[PDB]
């Protein structure tokens, strides 16, 4: 039966230089017996391949800056970013690897909010 | 050093039938997988399944079970996707990966369409 991958919302407001959550579900834990949890984050930008942020639910991928990070526990997942500049803006996606087939969730646009002149 | 590049867009009529390809460069092809995912205008990211670059083997989501086809000419370091008898609901843009190395095409537009597949 597949994993259903769920993200609580489909964008999240945020202003320059502040902090963000962004929250993923999974139907199954993706702790696996090898003590791994097969969990990753990618953002997309517009015009862009996906790319990756977090793998192993909270380990950073190279080239990634120490402002995102990722916690959660079994089917609940957090990815955070503590200080939001111009280029993070896009959608930020989970994704579990534990059992095929392999499952997005459903996107979370950061949306950087800005007043009108 | 590592690059996947990805064939040109496609703009296509109901029906037809297109075969993208995804050629692999910097690494040994056959060490690790290619991953097919299928982005949507309004449906985010999909997993299409993967195949093993070593055995041939592919591995489809069921979603994706009928008229996909995963393919390889390894000696030349390429995967292929072919997309049988063309439906709206293809219009996409699809990447290769390979997805433990985090590797990506720079993705294929496919354009399905009734009335301006000429265009091209
Ligand atoms: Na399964």
């Known amino acids: 039966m597949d994993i259903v991958m769920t993200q609580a919302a489909p964008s999240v407001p945020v202003t320059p230089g502040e902090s963000v959550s962004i929250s993923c579900r999974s139907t199954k834990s993706l702790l696996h017996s090898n003590g791994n949890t097969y969990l990753y984050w990618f953002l997309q930008r517009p015009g862009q391949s996906p790319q990756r942020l977090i793998y192993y639910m909270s380990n950073l991928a190279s080239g990634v800056p120490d402002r995102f990070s990722g916690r959660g526990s079994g089917t609940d997942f957090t990815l955070r970013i503590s200080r939001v500049e111009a280029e993070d803006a896009g959608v930020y996606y989970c994704?579990?690897?534990?059992?095929?087939?392999?499952?997005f969730g459903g996107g979370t646009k950061l949306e950087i909010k800005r007043l009108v002149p | 050093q590592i690059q996947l590049v990805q064939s040109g867009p496609e703009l296509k009529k109901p029906g037809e039938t297109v075969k993208i390809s995804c050629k692999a460069s910097?690494?040994?092809?056959?060490?690790?997988?290619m991953t097919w995912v299928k982005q949507a205008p309004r449906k985010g990211l999909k997993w299409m399944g993967w195949?093993?670059?070593?055995?041939?083997?592919?591995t489809y989501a069921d979603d994706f079970k009928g008229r996909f086809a995963f393919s390889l000419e390894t000696s030349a370091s390429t995967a292929y996707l072919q997309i049988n008898n063309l439906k709206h609901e293809d219009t996409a843009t699809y990447f290769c990966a390979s997805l433990g190395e985090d590797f990506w095409g720079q993705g294929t537009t496919l354009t399905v369409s009734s009335h301006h597949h000429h265009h091209h």
């Open positions: 195949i093993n670059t070593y055995t041939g083997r592919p």
């Open positions: 994704m579990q690897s534990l059992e095929y087939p392999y499952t």
């Open positions: 910097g690494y040994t092809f056959t060490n690790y997988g």
